[PDB]
């Protein structure tokens, strides 16, 4: 039983053309690694960095810049 919605009677829209492709489902469809091209970027979630020692690896406190000399 058709819904009709409200009126339904009155399209006359048609839209004619032909400029696409077609083959058949028997080919390649199933079985592919669905992880194509590693791409992602969001806002900073903020993880723990600099314990206190200032010298983790070389400089955890970014001792290379101003290092926040307090000025």
């Amino acid at each position: 039983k058709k819904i009709e919605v409200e009126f339904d009677k009155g399209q006359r829209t048609d839209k004619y053309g032909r400029g696409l492709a077609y083959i058949y489902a028997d080919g390649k469809m199933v079985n592919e690694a669905l992880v194509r091209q590693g791409l992602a970027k969001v806002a900073y979630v903020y993880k723990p960095n600099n314990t206190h020692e200032q010298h983790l690896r070389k400089s955890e406190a970014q001792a290379k810049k101003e290092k926040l000399n307090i000025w």
Binding site: K9, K15, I23, L34, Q37
Partner: protein
């Protein structure tokens, strides 16, 4: 008192099209829309195809319901002639009057004939462009249509391989945008909705909407402000194994992890 299809597109009014659909479908259903085709030159044929408002019960039955009414020389031959319709366009009911074919034509002719093989391949474009036509004509009619025949249309990219992009626009799904099981958001909407770093199309391949939307993989991205499309199909993974990329934007099943979920987390 005249054969409706044999008249011009202008000589048939809107009411008569929708009334005529009730004859060919053996129903009382009004079509959401249609396209009247009449072709001239070498091979003259009138094709008249409609888009139903709802799916008949016997649409997914062990018996066939896909196909058109074959007319030749404006004389009825047989109906449910499915050799004119693809699998992803099996929902179409309509008719086709062929002036070229023999009057003594039968079902096996339509299958093996090269002309009739071209007929199907021609009608494939007119229906598909009539689907996007309906999608732009009336989104609410197309929403009803996709709830009734959407499963069928998802078989699209598999058949018309090179034309995957056209069906990718027609594809409507749910997402973390709206909790509706209503298949609303398309890849058209998604590309428009995409923000900084969300260049990778996030989907979930899952057997049920309940287990899909109950998955923690969604909240992993949802809290970061990423949008994941909810697929609850039985054909989900099959279709999505060809949907590896669209517009240059590659797909990601959140059910799987790569460097994207490393950098995002």
């Amino acid at each position: 008192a005249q054969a409706l299809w044999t008249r011009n597109k202008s000589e048939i009014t809107d009411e008569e099209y929708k009334e005529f659909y009730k004859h060919i479908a053996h129903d009382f259903n009004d079509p959401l829309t249609w396209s009247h085709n009449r072709v001239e030159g070498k091979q003259e044929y009138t094709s008249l195809l409609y888009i139903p408002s709802q799916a008949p019960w016997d649409m997914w039955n062990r018996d066939h319901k896909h196909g058109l009414k074959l007319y030749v020389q404006r004389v009825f031959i047989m109906d449910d002639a499915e050799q004119f319709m693809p699998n992803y366009l099996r929902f179409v009911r309509g008719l086709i009057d062929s002036s070229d074919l023999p009057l003594n034509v039968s079902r096996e002719i339509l299958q093996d004939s090269t002309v009739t093989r071209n007929l199907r391949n021609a009608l494939t474009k007119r229906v598909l462009q009539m689907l996007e036509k309906l999608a732009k004509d009336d989104a609410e009619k197309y929403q009803t249509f996709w709830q009734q025949f959407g499963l069928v249309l998802k078989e699209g990219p598999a058949e018309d391989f090179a034309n995957q992009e056209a069906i990718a626009k027609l594809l409507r799904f749910a997402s973390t945008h709206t909790d509706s099981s209503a298949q609303t958001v398309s890849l058209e909407d998604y590309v428009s909705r995409m923000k900084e770093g969300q260049e990778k199309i996030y989907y979930i391949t899952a057997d049920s909407y309940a287990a899909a939307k109950s998955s923690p993989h969604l909240e992993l991205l949802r809290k970061k402000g990423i949008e994941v499309l909810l697929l609850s199909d039985r054909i989900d993974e099959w279709m999505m194994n060809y949907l590896t990329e669209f517009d240059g934007k590659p797909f990601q099943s959140v059910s799987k992890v790569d460097e994207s979920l490393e950098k995002l987390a």
